[PDB]
């Protein structure tokens, strides 16, 4: 008995993105030419002008109307009042999110060496999209997916959901090692748009965007996998005392909106550390002991309190910081193009004679607040 | 043979529901004297007649007058118009859900022997609230459960997501034994109401009921459970095809909205044995073999088809009846509530020598439409 025990591995991820990419000058233009926000726009310069996001894509072409696609109309109304009812705001959620989140899947299941019939559990994952018959319902139309197939719908987790799903997913997996499990997440922001007077809003223009990110899960043994294979090995939350106006979320007529704290980047700083050390000491590890980081793209405060927090360098972060500057925040999505970097620098060493990552670290941050995180070891 | 199988099996449940029980002759009265309800009139008391509900149970006193709590206000307009933002709506879910499942928990755990301590897993269940921090995050507050327990919130899944929280809660408890995981499902359709001017609304008005119920789930082997004990030995899915129309959730600006066609119930006579003779069929057992049949008690028409499909007498689902009549549709919890009614017979069976049920299968159906049910068997 040498050993036989069951690691939930990722056999496979996707990224994917909506039409537009949005430069940050073009989203300052727009949101400065919106009447209201007239009076606004010295602080939108500010959160705009220092976001050290380039760049963000978005579903709808109202952003970018100079290179706008043929067929595809603006959402939002002529008289720039942008208000449209929630459930219309979820429609077109649905609208676009099916041709997106169906292509990621695919490119998801291709990853691994399987055919769609080799899902057994599907995990669909947002914040931003609640529909009638859902997503999961989709997905399986569209690319054919066993009728029997187990639907979970995990919905309004916040930025963290990934985590959630991931548990969800490892779970299932460990209990059934020959089985498949598909992970999806995606959320689509630029269909709850509002531009409101406050700042907070307007932070929040500045920040959030549109992405979708699969994952296919495996029950794997130490025998089944090439050499430098990594496993999510364990699992870590905490529910963080005294953060309760952290992240504060809402569903309102005109669009599902967001909240976040002033202290909210002093609430990771003085927690942060907690969680990491707690996690680590499970497995007679130190902060030394990670190679690498995938700290959820946030915002800039997200990452440098972190960073503040767990004392590392931008090198450490820099695959966090370079979601943030190509994609912004695209809410729960994020952290997975972050582990999608870090999966492609593992393997390019490993291509080479290099043993790639030992061990490696994935966190965000949920409503509570909590920090959810996963540690990927080699099996 | 392999004896280390694993088993997930109920270890406690606790059944709940909020203050105020409202009759159908009340809440018929309540019906017929809102204003803007006049082209629907004379139908209402047919509707309320042939519903096979005798009672149900609500958040807000604005069913029961007379009977409101010392200090708690009519939440509606005294417009008798109906017309409340689904932000102030879903405020409400908060207000009134939080004591509801804090009780409900703080039983269910009590039934399992188990103390706040030793939950490792929290799993809420809402199609009628979503929460910036989540119920999951007021249960550890008011329960005071470890806060590093796994947490996942299951939304918008209609009726059935019991079922797909029973799944989550095995999945995490076979793959670690020695652990124990909580499922709770929380609704309050109560704080939808909107009294609109049509003939599908004004159904489900009659139907639809505020209600919870939670369960905590343990990982088993062959003889580590009294003599007697059922356990979810398996869960099966199935979409239907053509049956999109069948059940469709939106979230509109003036609260969460249901929306069934006429042809459900044909839907689910049509589909009904394709889903249960597939149950069986993976375990070699016919429809003979079952004991237990707990059947969603989604209204009137709904348990006749699934009588008519699966050839079942009045009195198998005599239980169905029981919760519908008393209850009313909770959603989620509705099938948890029959559930608990044939574990009352089956644990006073046990008490006095009796073998008790030794096969059950309780099923619901979710939006697309599909089937989603687990098989409970003797070990
Ligand atoms: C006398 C009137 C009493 C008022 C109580 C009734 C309220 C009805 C309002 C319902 C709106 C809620 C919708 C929530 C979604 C439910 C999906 C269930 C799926 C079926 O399957």
């Known amino acids: ?4 025990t069951v690691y939930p591995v990722i056999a496979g991820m996707a990224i994917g993105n909506p039409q537009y990419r949005c430069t940050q000058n073009e989203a300052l233009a727009v949101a400065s030419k919106c009447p209201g926000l007239e009076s606004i726009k010295p602080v939108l310069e500010r959160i705009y002008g220092n976001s050290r996001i380039g760049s963000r894509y978005f579903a709808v072409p109202d952003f970018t109307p100079g290179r706008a696609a043929k067929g595809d109309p603006l959402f939002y109304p002529a008289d720039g009042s942008y208000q449209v009812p929630v459930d219309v705001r979820l429609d077109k959620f649905k609208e676009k999110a099916v041709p997106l989140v169906s292509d990621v899947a695919r490119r998801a299941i291709k990853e691994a060496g399987l055919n769609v019939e080799d899902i057994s559990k599907l995990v669909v994952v947002s914040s931003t999209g609640f529909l009638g018959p859902g997503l999961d319902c989709e997905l399986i139309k569209n690319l054919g997916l066993t009728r029997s197939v187990d639907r979970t719908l995990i919905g309004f987790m916040g930025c963290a959901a990934a985590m959630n799903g991931f548990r969800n997913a ?5 209990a059934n090692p020959g089985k498949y499990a598909l992970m999806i997440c995606v959320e689509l922001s630029s269909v709850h748009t509002t531009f409101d007077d406050n700042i907070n809003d307007a932070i929040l223009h500045a920040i959030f965007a549109d992405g979708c990110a699969a994952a296919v899960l495996k029950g794997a043994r130490k025998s089944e996998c090439p050499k430098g294979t990594l496993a999510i090995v364990d699992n870590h939350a905490w529910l963080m005392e005294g953060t309760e106006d952290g992240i504060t979320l809402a569903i309102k007529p005109n669009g599902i909106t967001c909240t976040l704290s002033k202290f909210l980047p ?6 942060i550390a907690f969680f990491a050390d707690g996690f680590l000491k499970k497995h007679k590890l130190g902060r030394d002991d990670v190679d690498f ?9 997200i990452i440098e309190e972190a960073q503040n927090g767990l004392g590392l360098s931008e090198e450490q972060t820099a695959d966090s910081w370079a979601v943030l500057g190509e994609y912004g925040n695209m809410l729960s999505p994020s952290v997975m193009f972050v582990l999608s970097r870090v999966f492609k620098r593992h393997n390019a060493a490993l291509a080479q004679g290099k043993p790639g990552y030992q061990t490696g670290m994935a966190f965000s941050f949920s409503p509570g607040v909590g920090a959810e995180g996963i540690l990927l070891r080699q099996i």
Chains 1, 2 share one sequence.
Do not use: F, L, M, S
């Open 1 to 4: 008995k040498d050993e036989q």
């Open 170 to 174: 490892n779970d299932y997996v460990t």
């Open 266 to 271: 002093q609430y990771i700083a003085k927690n």
């Open 293 to 301: 980081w995938c700290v959820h793209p946030g915002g800039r405060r």
